[PDB]
Design an enzyme around this catalytic site. Structure first.
Site, PDB file in Angstrom:
ATOM      1  N   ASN C 124       0.790  -1.237   0.000  1.00 30.80           N
ATOM      2  CA  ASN C 124       0.000   0.000   0.000  1.00 30.80           C
ATOM      3  C   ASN C 124       0.820   1.283   0.000  1.00 30.80           C
ATOM      4  O   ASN C 124       0.287   2.330  -0.391  1.00 30.80           O
ATOM      5  CB  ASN C 124      -0.910   0.078   1.238  1.00 30.80           C
ATOM      6  N   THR C 174      16.140 -15.418 -29.790  1.00 30.08           N
ATOM      7  CA  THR C 174      14.680 -15.456 -29.855  1.00 30.08           C
ATOM      8  C   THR C 174      14.234 -15.652 -31.300  1.00 30.08           C
ATOM      9  O   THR C 174      14.691 -14.931 -32.195  1.00 30.08           O
ATOM     10  CB  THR C 174      14.074 -14.155 -29.315  1.00 30.08           C
ATOM     11  N   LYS C 176      12.192 -15.098 -34.527  1.00 29.15           N
ATOM     12  CA  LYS C 176      11.513 -13.922 -35.095  1.00 29.15           C
ATOM     13  C   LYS C 176      10.916 -14.291 -36.455  1.00 29.15           C
ATOM     14  O   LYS C 176      11.426 -15.184 -37.119  1.00 29.15           O
ATOM     15  CB  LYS C 176      12.483 -12.746 -35.262  1.00 29.15           C
ATOM     16  N   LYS C 178       8.185 -11.960 -34.037  1.00 29.70           N
ATOM     17  CA  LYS C 178       7.698 -12.292 -32.698  1.00 29.70           C
ATOM     18  C   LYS C 178       6.479 -13.201 -32.770  1.00 29.70           C
ATOM     19  O   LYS C 178       6.412 -14.221 -32.080  1.00 29.70           O
ATOM     20  CB  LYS C 178       7.349 -11.022 -31.917  1.00 29.70           C
ATOM     21  N   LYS C 202      14.758 -19.651 -28.314  1.00 28.84           N
ATOM     22  CA  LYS C 202      13.651 -19.458 -27.393  1.00 28.84           C
ATOM     23  C   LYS C 202      12.432 -18.887 -28.094  1.00 28.84           C
ATOM     24  O   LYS C 202      12.550 -18.144 -29.079  1.00 28.84           O
ATOM     25  CB  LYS C 202      14.041 -18.536 -26.224  1.00 28.84           C
ATOM     26  N   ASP C 204       9.466 -16.318 -28.284  1.00 32.56           N
ATOM     27  CA  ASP C 204       9.308 -14.955 -27.811  1.00 32.56           C
ATOM     28  C   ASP C 204       8.381 -14.941 -26.600  1.00 32.56           C
ATOM     29  O   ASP C 204       7.571 -15.850 -26.402  1.00 32.56           O
ATOM     30  CB  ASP C 204       8.743 -14.059 -28.913  1.00 32.56           C
ATOM     31  N   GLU C 205       8.487 -13.882 -25.790  1.00 31.15           N
ATOM     32  CA  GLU C 205       7.690 -13.844 -24.568  1.00 31.15           C
ATOM     33  C   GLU C 205       6.193 -13.920 -24.862  1.00 31.15           C
ATOM     34  O   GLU C 205       5.435 -14.484 -24.062  1.00 31.15           O
ATOM     35  CB  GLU C 205       8.015 -12.592 -23.746  1.00 31.15           C
ATOM     36  N   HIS C 294      11.675 -14.814 -18.347  1.00 33.38           N
ATOM     37  CA  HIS C 294      11.596 -13.566 -19.088  1.00 33.38           C
ATOM     38  C   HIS C 294      10.884 -12.545 -18.203  1.00 33.38           C
ATOM     39  O   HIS C 294       9.895 -12.869 -17.537  1.00 33.38           O
ATOM     40  CB  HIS C 294      10.843 -13.788 -20.401  1.00 33.38           C
ATOM     41  N   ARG C 295      11.409 -11.320 -18.158  1.00 34.71           N
ATOM     42  CA  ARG C 295      10.946 -10.354 -17.168  1.00 34.71           C
ATOM     43  C   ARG C 295       9.860  -9.424 -17.714  1.00 34.71           C
ATOM     44  O   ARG C 295       9.772  -8.264 -17.301  1.00 34.71           O
ATOM     45  CB  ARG C 295      12.122  -9.550 -16.608  1.00 34.71           C
ATOM     46  N   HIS C 327      16.473 -12.486 -17.432  1.00 31.88           N
ATOM     47  CA  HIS C 327      16.987 -11.397 -18.250  1.00 31.88           C
ATOM     48  C   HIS C 327      17.445 -10.263 -17.345  1.00 31.88           C
ATOM     49  O   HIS C 327      16.739  -9.876 -16.409  1.00 31.88           O
ATOM     50  CB  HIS C 327      15.905 -10.897 -19.213  1.00 31.88           C
ATOM     51  N   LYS C 334      19.348  -2.553 -27.178  1.00 29.86           N
ATOM     52  CA  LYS C 334      18.245  -1.632 -27.427  1.00 29.86           C
ATOM     53  C   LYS C 334      17.455  -1.279 -26.170  1.00 29.86           C
ATOM     54  O   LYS C 334      16.654  -0.341 -26.212  1.00 29.86           O
ATOM     55  CB  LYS C 334      17.301  -2.220 -28.491  1.00 29.86           C
ATOM     56  N   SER C 379      20.028  -9.807 -23.495  1.00 27.83           N
ATOM     57  CA  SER C 379      19.219  -9.970 -24.692  1.00 27.83           C
ATOM     58  C   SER C 379      18.682  -8.624 -25.152  1.00 27.83           C
ATOM     59  O   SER C 379      18.351  -7.768 -24.327  1.00 27.83           O
ATOM     60  CB  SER C 379      18.057 -10.935 -24.410  1.00 27.83           C
TER      61      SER C 379
HETATM   62  O1  LIG Z   1      -3.825  -1.609   5.022  1.00 24.72           O
HETATM   63  C1  LIG Z   1      -4.550  -0.605   4.808  1.00 24.72           C
HETATM   64  O2  LIG Z   1      -4.178   0.571   5.050  1.00 24.72           O
HETATM   65  C2  LIG Z   1      -6.021  -0.859   4.603  1.00 24.72           C
HETATM   66  O3  LIG Z   1      -6.379  -2.060   5.313  1.00 24.72           O
HETATM   67  C3  LIG Z   1      -6.856   0.323   5.115  1.00 24.72           C
HETATM   68  O4  LIG Z   1      -6.935   0.359   6.539  1.00 24.72           O
HETATM   69  P1  LIG Z   1      -7.723   1.572   7.261  1.00 24.72           P
HETATM   70  O5  LIG Z   1      -9.181   1.322   6.953  1.00 24.72           O
HETATM   71  O6  LIG Z   1      -7.361   1.406   8.712  1.00 24.72           O
HETATM   72  O7  LIG Z   1      -7.156   2.830   6.656  1.00 24.72           O
HETATM   73  C4  LIG Z   1      -6.298  -1.105   3.123  1.00 24.72           C
HETATM   74  O8  LIG Z   1      -5.616  -2.286   2.701  1.00 24.72           O
HETATM   75  C5  LIG Z   1      -5.891   0.081   2.246  1.00 24.72           C
HETATM   76  O9  LIG Z   1      -6.981   1.005   2.243  1.00 24.72           O
HETATM   77  C6  LIG Z   1      -5.653  -0.332   0.802  1.00 24.72           C
HETATM   78  O10 LIG Z   1      -5.616   0.838  -0.027  1.00 24.72           O
HETATM   79  P2  LIG Z   1      -6.409   0.892  -1.434  1.00 24.72           P
HETATM   80  O11 LIG Z   1      -7.848   0.593  -1.086  1.00 24.72           O
HETATM   81  O12 LIG Z   1      -6.146   2.287  -1.955  1.00 24.72           O
HETATM   82  O13 LIG Z   1      -5.749  -0.177  -2.274  1.00 24.72           O
HETATM   83  O1  LIG Z   2      11.368  -9.482 -27.780  1.00 22.86           O
HETATM   84  C1  LIG Z   2      12.536  -9.035 -27.729  1.00 22.86           C
HETATM   85  O2  LIG Z   2      12.850  -7.890 -28.148  1.00 22.86           O
HETATM   86  C2  LIG Z   2      13.624 -10.016 -27.392  1.00 22.86           C
HETATM   87  O3  LIG Z   2      13.212 -11.315 -27.854  1.00 22.86           O
HETATM   88  C3  LIG Z   2      14.942  -9.603 -28.061  1.00 22.86           C
HETATM   89  O4  LIG Z   2      14.935  -9.831 -29.470  1.00 22.86           O
HETATM   90  P1  LIG Z   2      16.239  -9.434 -30.332  1.00 22.86           P
HETATM   91  O5  LIG Z   2      17.306 -10.395 -29.860  1.00 22.86           O
HETATM   92  O6  LIG Z   2      15.826  -9.630 -31.776  1.00 22.86           O
HETATM   93  O7  LIG Z   2      16.498  -8.005 -29.948  1.00 22.86           O
HETATM   94  C4  LIG Z   2      13.795 -10.104 -25.875  1.00 22.86           C
HETATM   95  O8  LIG Z   2      12.583 -10.590 -25.299  1.00 22.86           O
HETATM   96  C5  LIG Z   2      14.165  -8.768 -25.236  1.00 22.86           C
HETATM   97  O9  LIG Z   2      15.590  -8.649 -25.309  1.00 22.86           O
HETATM   98  C6  LIG Z   2      13.773  -8.716 -23.763  1.00 22.86           C
HETATM   99  O10 LIG Z   2      14.419  -7.590 -23.153  1.00 22.86           O
HETATM  100  P2  LIG Z   2      15.200  -7.741 -21.751  1.00 22.86           P
HETATM  101  O11 LIG Z   2      16.221  -8.834 -21.983  1.00 22.86           O
HETATM  102  O12 LIG Z   2      15.789  -6.376 -21.486  1.00 22.86           O
HETATM  103  O13 LIG Z   2      14.110  -8.104 -20.765  1.00 22.86           O
HETATM  104 MG   LIG Z   3      -4.801  -3.418   4.373  1.00 22.83          MG
HETATM  105 MG   LIG Z   4      11.206 -11.337 -26.785  1.00 21.59          MG
END
Ligand SMILES: O=C(O)[C@@](O)(COP(=O)(O)O)[C@H](O)[C@H](O)COP(=O)(O)O
Ligand SMILES: O=C(O)[C@@](O)(COP(=O)(O)O)[C@H](O)[C@H](O)COP(=O)(O)O
Ligand SMILES: [Mg+2]
Ligand SMILES: [Mg+2]
Ligand SMILES: [Mg+2]
Lengths: 481, 139, 481, 139, 139
Positions: C124, C174, C176, C178, C202, C204-205, C294-295, C327, C334, C379
């Site tokens: 939160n 990867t 291609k 994609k 691999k 692609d994601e 893959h991130r 990754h 790039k 990558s």
């Molecule tokens: O942990 C907290 O703070 C709460 O339990 C609120 O407690 P209170 O009722 O005691 O404030 C909720 O999870 C947040 O409101 C989440 O925010 P949102 O709804 O914006 O995701």
């Molecule tokens: O989709 C893409 O672009 C790629 O397959 C790269 O292809 P190329 O090899 O043809 O560039 C990878 O997923 C990215 O590198 C991910 O980025 P990161 O590793 O930063 O998460």
């Molecule tokens: Mg809460």
């Molecule tokens: Mg990719």
């Protein structure tokens, strides 16, 4: 050499690097199809990067392109699968920030899979060097893709029918302190709060299973408190039992336990991630369980205007996935919430269709394909003295949650719950009589009038009368009125 | 005890003038009103008894109040509630339900506990009025 | 009234609002315990908010506090569970941004659960109105908590033993375009790339299962290409089969299918989320499978310096969860990657222990508790002409992935793979002989020397010699030297 | 075909001078060298035959080259590889392995395909040299 | 035996004149031609070796025939096939594949039978040419 003789020699497919806007990913004349997925990005190009090239790069690297030309495109119906940036507008009152509209072919996406949709739309483009900031602001999910998703397991309408509660917002409260209570004392708080008037209580988002309280102790004690409050009042009662856990196997174990003991509702945290969320959304429908989504971690990418994902897109993805509740803001509480943005979130969660409404951040017309309506939850730093503002901004179909605003009452938890419920009912009754309740004279007076015969409300109004959270917002509109 | 089903049961019993204003609001939204009666207050007693048909084509709130007061004259002691139905796409459901009549004395409920597996308890909410007498003579 | 007589009247627990820094969440004299979880936040308070109060608010609302005092604290060992902000420093070259250190008791957290850790640390606090921007920069996960986690299913050492490949970086690509290829053509690309020299290819994601190619067609055709390439070369070969899917049931189905047909490796996308990732990390260890992460989506919260989560923290959470690859950037490709930040990420993934190293963004000393080492993957937009920079910045234990840089070769996929492998081996051989290979004269000449007898490398070097991605970084260090 | 196990097999066969520079590098990092021989080139043949013990306490790269050249004199036709072992915590593994000798002619492999369930193929990689002759007589 | 993969293998071996007519037909429909070679005739050997890239931009059938005859001069004894690829939506696949060259003598295959569970047999189709010699030396 055969390889040299058969080298491709056309402008588009000879080896080498060419701009994305010349690879097919920019088309100002593109005719959007009703089956296309549309995205709206806020793009801040690096100095010197052409805004249209930046938009075409997002379109290319979120669909079929990479950084150099590849002949293998020619083994596919390549023009069909390329996404097209088709409109690039300057952002109002800004230098070198642009709104870019991009269209994606329906066939790019795995049916019913949020992880596949997000793998394309947000997968890599936010890390591209040539763009210094990027924000996904809105999406048009077409009717044909929506029909592949379940939508909410229960939805607002069946939820109210299960609770037999119609005519006012629902009421809830997070148990406090956030961490440290035992299972037995957790059940005591739940018992007192429900008996005092609340429809629900809930586990805090970080209450899962811990040395100070293992989860089965909490679940069984809460079911005693819930059923005690139900027999004391004649109402359906519940508490959001948090089934968030490390693994899907453990999540299912907690869900099945909650069902086996008769809980009306469970809750999950967004940090569990899209695949677990979709799994438990299907489970909830199949097991007659309300599914409450806490949006833990959302603000790590949803807070800032220049970069990330606007929460209104999260609203669409989570209503698609099929949670029954999602936290969506309060305007007047302790968490960020510009009223134009919040009203937009609530409309996205609750309406059957959306019309373009730029001051609310609604950039796309969109039919919701009869997916059920998702119940927004207003939670965090609110108190019953604000009831006229909550009813005004957030409407009828919402759960108003008062954690500190219930348990912080000096005369006890039952008194805190009663104060909240009297204030809610008195405000709704006056509204339906035609009172100008949002007016700063009328609204607070409605509450004082009800407090004349309700000591707990008189005490709560006096305790928190000076409390407000007024700060400059980060997530603000770009269009006025 | 006070049965706190309905959406205004933490407020005092509504007067006829208060009820008429709620009816007028709902009818101004194009909602259909109906009146229902029960002497089973159980929280899961979904289907209270219909008092005639819902008043779909009625436009004067006084006609709704007339039927409420006919139900009050005719029905046994117990509960009456007033409902407003929204037939619109996206809703097709009740959007307001509140108590208009309640018995002078409601004994309420107790919690029956059966020993389940392990530490689980199998619960049943039991109404004192219902277990004692049949429908029509519970209050 | 008994309620009035028993009202709490102490300064700390009488009802009402008091500052978080007066509630126990600020302690400049706190002695950090070796079992504490430590977090470092970059905090930008709203104008007028005291920096220590802001730090105490983060500590309170990520541990046990809410916005008003609650007597239920007194039912717990409340001082033990409160987190303590214990140090607030100005960020260098800034007047309104602060580094805040916060200590959390070990017992706050569910054993082996990333979803519980993140529910507290990021749940939160990023949405609090009183703070206009917040970034989680680093964490000290103590040895005692780390031992509850699996760490990488396989890890770098056993991975190389399974592949029988020691002495150079691993190589990949990867497929291609994609999207759009059929399963049969996917297997063709995989066959050609592996036969030409790559260790892996691999998916692609965003390649999961789609109308143009359903996943079982891809898996079976890739296994034919993999085994064909293995029999043609005498090497262990593989391809990261993407098992990302909508539901955990479907993810397991694709994982089990990959195992049943003998794949050495599968891949998953970060958008699937923490609970699915931990589930598959356990599965991977139990099923003798390499697990590539893959991130996807990471840059939605990791890109900007002012707000979000620094990727170095994601590195810690994912090494804890137990993926075998992640990754982690290229510096010269790039996608965004300042070299000081990237060198920090690689150390976090690969070392047995961490020392404070502020220019690399390593703010905490941390033992990795013998959790296995996670293989970084470089990558995106790289090509073999950059091999001396990749070896210099990224070291020995990395997978270098060349998608466009393989498939974009004019003489075919096999030629593209061969050029990459010759360049890699020639650079490592020269490095081990003592060449000053990172030098702009020496490094490129090593490659031209090897190209004199390898036509595919000569072609690749001439094609991409002018390609660079030089832009101002967003994720930059705060300390120099 | 060319067996491309090892980390330098996409370069020409290494000279003795090139091999000594790699050995010198590894030994300067404190690594232990050993030499191994096989005439089964299968990619899953983990355990090539040891040539003596690894040279743990050896400090002169010339001593490693001496043993390599004794193995070359004594072993049957086939493959020899040079390995460097890192016993340090966090590794405890080989960190470099490359081929120093290969046969003049390697026939390579074929892919045996068994009909599995559905469309699945059960694969076996088969060595021409191994299926034809016993160890010590394959090249 | 005669390998009867391909779509014209129950007709006599095609002359260059006949092949050119098939090529002209495919190119008149906008298809992309390519030429592939193998000496593994197994029915599950999906990926014959590419002879360069597919001729996506070529419009003269004689250019395709030139490349076929360059493949015939350069490749080892075995099989060559001619393929036509349709990249249009709904197909994105080969739409014609036929044999242009076959060995003078194909020994064919035998059926290896493994005793499965119950009465089931686990089958493997084995090529005489492949089991005998490595790629490039099989015919
Ligand atoms: O942990 C907290 O703070 C709460 O339990 C609120 O407690 P209170 O009722 O005691 O404030 C909720 O999870 C947040 O409101 C989440 O925010 P949102 O709804 O914006 O995701
Ligand atoms: O989709 C893409 O672009 C790629 O397959 C790269 O292809 P190329 O090899 O043809 O560039 C990878 O997923 C990215 O590198 C991910 O980025 P990161 O590793 O930063 O998460
Ligand atoms: Mg809460
Ligand atoms: Mg990719
Ligand atoms: Mg056999």
């Amino acid at each position: 050499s055969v390889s040299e003789r058969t080298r491709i020699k056309s402008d588009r497919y000879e080896s080498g690097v060419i701009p994305y806007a010349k690879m097919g990913y920019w088309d100002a004349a593109y005719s959007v199809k009703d089956t296309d997925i549309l995205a709206l990005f806020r793009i801040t190009p690096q100095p010197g990067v052409d805004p249209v090239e930046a938009a075409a790069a997002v379109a290319g690297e979120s669909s079929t392109a990479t950084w150099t030309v590849v002949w293998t495109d020619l083994l596919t119906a390549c023009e069909r699968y390329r996404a097209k940036a088709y409109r690039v507008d300057p952002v109002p009152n800004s230098t070198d920030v642009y709104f870019a509209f991009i269209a994606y072919e329906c066939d790019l996406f795995e049916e019913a899979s949020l992880s596949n949709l997000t793998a394309s739309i947000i997968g890599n483009v936010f890390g591209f060097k040539a763009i210094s900031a990027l924000r996904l602001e809105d999406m048009r999910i077409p009717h044909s893709y929506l029909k592949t998703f379940q939508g909410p397991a229960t939805g607002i309408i069946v939820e109210r029918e299960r609770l037999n509660k119609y005519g006012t917002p629902l009421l809830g409260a997070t148990v406090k302190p956030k961490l440290g209570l035992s299972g037995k004392n957790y059940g005591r708080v739940v018992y007192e709060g429900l008996k005092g008037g609340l429809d629900f209580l809930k586990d805090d988002e970080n209450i899962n299973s811990q040395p100070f309280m293992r989860w089965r102790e909490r679940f069984l004690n809460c079911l005693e408190g819930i059923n005690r409050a139900a027999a004391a009042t004649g109402e359906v009662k519940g508490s959001y039992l948090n089934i968030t856990a490390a693994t899907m196997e453990e999540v299912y174990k907690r869900a099945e336990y909650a069902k086996a003991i008769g809980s009306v509702v469970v809750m999950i945290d967004l940090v569990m991630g899209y695949t677990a969320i979709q799994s438990i959304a299907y489970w909830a429908r199949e097991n007659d369980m309300l599914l409450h989504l806490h949006r833990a971690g959302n603000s790590t990418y949803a807070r800032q205007k220049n970069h990330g994902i606007n929460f209104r897109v999260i609203c669409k993805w989570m209503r698609m996935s099929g949670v029954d509740h999602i936290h969506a803001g309060t305007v007047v509480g302790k968490l960020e919430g510009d009223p134009l943005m919040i009203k937009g979130f609530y409309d996205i969660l609750r309406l059957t269709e959306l019309e373009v409404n730029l001051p609310f951040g609604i950039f796309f017309e969109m039919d919701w394909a009869s997916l059920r309506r998702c119940m927004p939850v207003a939670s965090g730093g609110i108190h019953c003295g604000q009831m006229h503002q909550l009813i005004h901004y957030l409407g009828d179909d919402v759960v108003l949650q008062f954690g500190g605003g219930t348990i912080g009452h000096p005369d006890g938890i039952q008194a805190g719950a009663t104060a909240n419920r009297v204030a809610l009912e008195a405000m709704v009754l006056a509204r339906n009589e035609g009172a100008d309740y949002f007016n700063n004279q009328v609204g607070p007076q409605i509450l004082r009038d009800a407090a004349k015969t309700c000591g707990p409300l008189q005490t709560a109004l006096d305790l928190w009368k000076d409390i407000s959270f007024n700060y400059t917002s980060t997530d603000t509109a770009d269009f006025a009125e | 005890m006070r049965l706190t089903q309905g959406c205004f049961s933490f407020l005092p019993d509504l007067t006829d003038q208060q009820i008429e204003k709620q009816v007028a609001c709902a009818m101004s939204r194009g909602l259909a009103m109906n009146v229902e009666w029960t002497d089973d207050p159980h929280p899961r007693n979904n289907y209270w008894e219909l008092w005639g048909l819902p008043l779909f084509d009625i436009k004067d709130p006084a006609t709704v109040m007339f039927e409420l007061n006919e139900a009050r004259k005719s029905c046994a002691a117990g509960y009456i509630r007033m409902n407003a139905f929204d037939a619109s796409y996206g809703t097709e459901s009740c959007v307001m339900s509140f108590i208009t009549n309640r018995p002078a004395n409601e004994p309420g409920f107790y919690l029956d506990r059966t020993e389940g597996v392990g530490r689980q308890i199998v619960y049943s909410i039991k109404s004192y009025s219902v277990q004692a007498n049949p429908e029509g003579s519970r209050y």
